[PDB]
RNA sequence: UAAGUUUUAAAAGGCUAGAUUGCCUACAUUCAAUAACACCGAAUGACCCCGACUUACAAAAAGUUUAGGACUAAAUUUAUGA
RNA sequence: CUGAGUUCAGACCGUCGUGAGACAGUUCGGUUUCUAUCUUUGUCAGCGAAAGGCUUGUUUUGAAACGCCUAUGCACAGUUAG
RNA sequence: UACCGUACUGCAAACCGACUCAGGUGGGCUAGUAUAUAUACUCAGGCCAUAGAAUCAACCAUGUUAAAGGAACUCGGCAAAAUGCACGCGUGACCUCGGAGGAAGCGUGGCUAAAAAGACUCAGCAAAUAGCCGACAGCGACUGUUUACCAAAAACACAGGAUAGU
């Protein structure tokens, strides 16, 4: 619980001010709101390193102390973006990715069309409502109702 | 240990890259240790005149067994060689080539002490 | 791999030999309950013997100890 | 090649085949199922029953 | 075919090394949540011998004690047991935690079986010897640990009269921070 | 374990039976179900086994230790300098 | 242990034959079963009991143990067999 | 709006094999890493009953590793071992021009990097799955078929052609 409150101080910390933001000084800000929280550095950078890995922030280059970004002994700078991604790279790269996947899609589909088979695998419609999820519905709204 | 229809690399100038173990001179009815003298048959040549298909006369210089010596210690080689001899116990190579030419000799070997590069 | 011959009953209980059992030269008995066994092995109430009475082990005053019962 | 089953079960075969009405189809069925009561057994056919 | 009994060494109790060490640990788990239980003689003295590893380590107090036994030790309702009531108790003890009374032979198989219990607990079968036992000062024993380098090595309390004078004092508590 | 290391004389060396001679407080249970560990070992005046501690100058087989098992006794030690 | 060759069943080439076929003429391919009763042999083990008389050398309240020769057991075991 | 089926079993201890038999038995439905119904781990679900218990026999079966050699073994490299994968280069004769051919042979791969780069590891197709290659001949054009139970082949068939009859 703590580890969840002490993560989203460091988000709001970022969140406030939205400039790319090094581990020094989101540990000195989240420090300097109200020794509260943060004692040491190595727990802000697993904190931001983990919020890092569920894609809730980013990293970018520092300059002067480069050292080869992936060495994980660089600093580096965290955006914090404000959705939780859906995946990792960054966007441009993901869509030019999400493009010559479809293209490979489409050159899939039609080989598999000079071959006496189907373009895409056609798969049988399935039922996912049962008693349960119908009850469990009632439970929830009854729950945000009250 | 050397056994017979092995292979090594004839190191000297002598004319042959290869040879295959056919015999072994002395009782040694096991295998062939570095300062033995062995039959080897040439199977592939330098281009030079020891053409390929001789049956000549070889010392093996060196082994991948350790060579075990009395006072405890060994000398591992990661090669296994030879050096080609004359019907007088004498190289027919001018020198042995220092491409794998050194080993630990002082038995009337005398002659072997000038042809390799270094000993010991 | 096969008897040639029907084997006879003397030479059959000699072959036999080797089958039978050796007596034990030692037992353990409770006084009370008349149990037997080895003088190495429980044979109380715990093991199995449902003729125990307790009577087997005749002292065992343990009242006093201290600890944290994790629950 | 593991044999002895040879027998593989079929209602409708059965049938078809051992059957009474096949038996008086033919002449010589007929012969086969009057010398099957002449012997006295207790079934006639392979599907007789009450 | 490897000679594990008469060289010292762990039973193969009829099973792959892998199943032996998880049929292990499932049974020192089962020790220590009922203290007593009973099986056959091959698995009683492995269980004895695993027993004191497990029990030295819980005796070690350390996070990396904690990990360790974390993988070894299954039910973590006994984790527990094992880190603080085991610990607690066996202390000052050096080895010998567990004891094996032989118990006759079972119905299915007529393998000989034995009773695997902790020592030192209300509810054992026989009284169990104290850990230490104190020095006479005027023995030639003490005198034999004084000349070569031994300890004292005395019983003791929980938290001995060697802490009171730190303890009893307000300024060192820190307020609990 | 060998590919390693020792030794392979006249007669040497081994196996089985044994004249004799000597001795005798010897019913044979336990320490783990295949002692082959152990009879050229132990069973509490017991380190026999097991555990614990230490050793990189053993990448681990020795040293301390009666904690546990080989039960057992008192009017001078719940007990060997094990 | 193999079945490489000497027994087949398939096929081809050559010889002979009207032909079914024959060839110890050449070829390619083509089921090796058996859990040891007792006779040997290697090795590991079990069984093959004794107490005889002591007129007991002694004692009274020929019976009881004591003292003897050897009987087993155990140990070392011929200038001792095989 | 009647009549018949509706239990249980159905890759199996309930069917066909004398058996609670390691054999044979048709169709359909399906989650994730992930990507193919292949492969490794797992979801839903199911299972750990039909001899058990320890231990170091020899030997047998099935495998792992092995120093220096390496077909020297053997009727015969039989059996094992070895290549085994996606992106690049490349790439012989002979030939019915289609093929041989994935010829042969050589680089490049995991991990971190909103990213010009690097870390250390003995090892980065890191665990499981996915051709040994080349040459000289003989026979049969080819894919197929053949003695259920010792022979799958050069034997049979084949498209085509020739002959004879109609
Ligand atoms: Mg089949
Ligand atoms: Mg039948
Ligand atoms: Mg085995
Ligand atoms: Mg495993
Ligand atoms: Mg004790
Ligand atoms: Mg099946
Ligand atoms: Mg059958
Ligand atoms: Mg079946
Ligand atoms: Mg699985
Ligand atoms: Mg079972
Ligand atoms: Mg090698
Ligand atoms: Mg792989
Ligand atoms: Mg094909
Ligand atoms: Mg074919
Ligand atoms: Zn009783």
């Given at each position: 619980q703590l580890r969840r409150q002490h993560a989203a101080m460091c988000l709001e910390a970022l969140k406030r001010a939205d400039r790319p933001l090094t581990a020094e000084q989101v540990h000195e800000a989240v420090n300097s709101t109200a020794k509260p929280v943060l004692s040491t550095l190595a727990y802000t950078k697993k904190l931001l390193e983990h919020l890092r890995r569920t894609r809730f922030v980013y990293g970018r280059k520092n300059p002067d102390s480069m050292?080869?970004?992936?060495?994980?002994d660089h600093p580096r700078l965290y955006e914090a973006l404000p959705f939780q991604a859906?995946?990792?790279?960054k966007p441009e790269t993901l869509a030019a990715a999400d493009e010559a996947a479809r293209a490979a899609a489409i050159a899939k589909a039609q080989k598999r069309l000079r071959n006496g088979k189907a373009p895409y695998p056609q798969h049988r419609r399935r039922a996912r409502f049962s008693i349960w999820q119908h009850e469990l519905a009632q439970e929830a709204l009854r729950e945000l109702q009250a | 240990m050397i056994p017979k229809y092995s292979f090594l690399k004839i190191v000297?100038?002598?004319?042959?890259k290869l040879a295959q173990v056919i015999?072994?001179?002395?009782?040694?009815?096991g295998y062939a240790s570095v300062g033995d003298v062995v039959k080897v048959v040439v199977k592939?040549?330098?281009?030079?005149?020891?053409?390929?298909?001789v049956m000549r006369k070889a010392v093996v210089?060196?082994?991948?067994?350790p060579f075990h010596r009395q006072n405890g210690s060994h000398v591992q080689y990661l090669r296994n060689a030879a050096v080609l001899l004359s019907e007088?116990?004498?190289?027919?190579?001018?020198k042995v080539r220092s491409m794998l030419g050194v080993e630990f000799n002082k038995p009337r070997w005398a002659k072997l002490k000038s042809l390799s590069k270094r000993l010991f | 791999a096969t008897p040639k011959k029907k084997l006879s009953l003397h030479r059959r209980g000699n072959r036999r030999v080797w089958y039978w059992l050796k007596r034990k030269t030692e037992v353990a008995k409770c006084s009370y309950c008349g149990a037997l066994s080895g003088r190495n092995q429980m044979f109380s109430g715990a093991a199995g013997?449902?003729?125990?009475?307790?009577?087997?082990?005749?002292q065992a005053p343990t009242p006093p100890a201290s600890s944290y019962p994790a629950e | 090649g593991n044999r002895g089953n040879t027998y593989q079960p079929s209602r409708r075969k059965r049938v078809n085949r051992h059957g009474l009405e096949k038996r008086l189809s033919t002449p010589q069925g007929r012969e086969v199922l009057l010398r099957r009561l002449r012997k006295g057994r207790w079934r006639i056919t392979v599907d007789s029953f009450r | 075919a490897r000679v594990r009994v008469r060289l010292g060494d762990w039973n193969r109790?009829?099973?792959?090394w892998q199943h032996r060490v998880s049929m292990m640990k499932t049974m020192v788990t089962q020790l220590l949540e009922k203290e007593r239980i009973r099986t056959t003689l091959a698995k009683a003295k492995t269980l004895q011998r695993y027993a004191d590893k497990v029990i030295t380590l819980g005796k070690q107090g350390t996070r990396e004690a904690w990990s360790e036994a974390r993988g070894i030790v299954r039910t973590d309702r006994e984790l527990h047991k094992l880190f603080t009531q085991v610990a607690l108790r066996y202390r000052?003890?050096?080895?010998?935690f567990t004891r094996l009374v032989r118990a006759g032979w079972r119905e299915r198989d007529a393998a000989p079986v034995a009773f695997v219990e902790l020592v030192?607990?209300?509810?054992?079968?026989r009284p169990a010897n104290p850990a230490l036992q104190r020095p006479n000062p005027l023995s030639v024993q003490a005198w034999i640990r004084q000349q070569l380098?031994?300890?004292?090595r005395e019983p003791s309390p929980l938290?001995?009269?060697?802490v009171q004078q730190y303890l009893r004092e307000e300024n060192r508590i820190q307020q609990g921070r």
């Amino acid at each position: 619980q703590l580890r969840r409150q002490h993560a989203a101080m460091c988000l709001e910390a970022l969140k406030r001010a939205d400039r790319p933001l090094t581990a020094e000084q989101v540990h000195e800000a989240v420090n300097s709101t109200a020794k509260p929280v943060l004692s040491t550095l190595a727990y802000t950078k697993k904190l931001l390193e983990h919020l890092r890995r569920t894609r809730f922030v980013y990293g970018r280059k520092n300059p002067d102390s480069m050292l080869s970004p992936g060495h994980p002994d660089h600093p580096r700078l965290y955006e914090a973006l404000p959705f939780q991604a859906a995946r990792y790279g960054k966007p441009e790269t993901l869509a030019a990715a999400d493009e010559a996947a479809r293209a490979a899609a489409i050159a899939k589909a039609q080989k598999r069309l000079r071959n006496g088979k189907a373009p895409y695998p056609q798969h049988r419609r399935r039922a996912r409502f049962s008693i349960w999820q119908h009850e469990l519905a009632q439970e929830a709204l009854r729950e945000l109702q009250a | 240990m050397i056994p017979k229809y092995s292979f090594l690399k004839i190191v000297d100038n002598s004319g042959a890259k290869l040879a295959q173990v056919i015999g072994f001179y002395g009782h040694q009815g096991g295998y062939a240790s570095v300062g033995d003298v062995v039959k080897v048959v040439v199977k592939e040549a330098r281009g030079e005149k020891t053409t390929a298909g001789v049956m000549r006369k070889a010392v093996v210089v060196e082994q991948k067994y350790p060579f075990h010596r009395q006072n405890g210690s060994h000398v591992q080689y990661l090669r296994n060689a030879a050096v080609l001899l004359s019907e007088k116990g004498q190289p027919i190579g001018n020198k042995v080539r220092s491409m794998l030419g050194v080993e630990f000799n002082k038995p009337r070997w005398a002659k072997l002490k000038s042809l390799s590069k270094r000993l010991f | 791999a096969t008897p040639k011959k029907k084997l006879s009953l003397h030479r059959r209980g000699n072959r036999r030999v080797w089958y039978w059992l050796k007596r034990k030269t030692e037992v353990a008995k409770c006084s009370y309950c008349g149990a037997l066994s080895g003088r190495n092995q429980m044979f109380s109430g715990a093991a199995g013997n449902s003729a125990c009475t307790g009577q087997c082990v005749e002292q065992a005053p343990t009242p006093p100890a201290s600890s944290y019962p994790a629950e | 090649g593991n044999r002895g089953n040879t027998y593989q079960p079929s209602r409708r075969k059965r049938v078809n085949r051992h059957g009474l009405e096949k038996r008086l189809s033919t002449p010589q069925g007929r012969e086969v199922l009057l010398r099957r009561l002449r012997k006295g057994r207790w079934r006639i056919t392979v599907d007789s029953f009450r | 075919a490897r000679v594990r009994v008469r060289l010292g060494d762990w039973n193969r109790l009829n099973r792959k090394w892998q199943h032996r060490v998880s049929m292990m640990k499932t049974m020192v788990t089962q020790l220590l949540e009922k203290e007593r239980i009973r099986t056959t003689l091959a698995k009683a003295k492995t269980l004895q011998r695993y027993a004191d590893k497990v029990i030295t380590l819980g005796k070690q107090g350390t996070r990396e004690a904690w990990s360790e036994a974390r993988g070894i030790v299954r039910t973590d309702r006994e984790l527990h047991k094992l880190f603080t009531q085991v610990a607690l108790r066996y202390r000052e003890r050096p080895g010998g935690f567990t004891r094996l009374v032989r118990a006759g032979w079972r119905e299915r198989d007529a393998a000989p079986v034995a009773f695997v219990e902790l020592v030192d607990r209300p509810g054992e079968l026989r009284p169990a010897n104290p850990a230490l036992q104190r020095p006479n000062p005027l023995s030639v024993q003490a005198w034999i640990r004084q000349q070569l380098g031994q300890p004292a090595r005395e019983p003791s309390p929980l938290l001995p009269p060697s802490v009171q004078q730190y303890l009893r004092e307000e300024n060192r508590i820190q307020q609990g921070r």
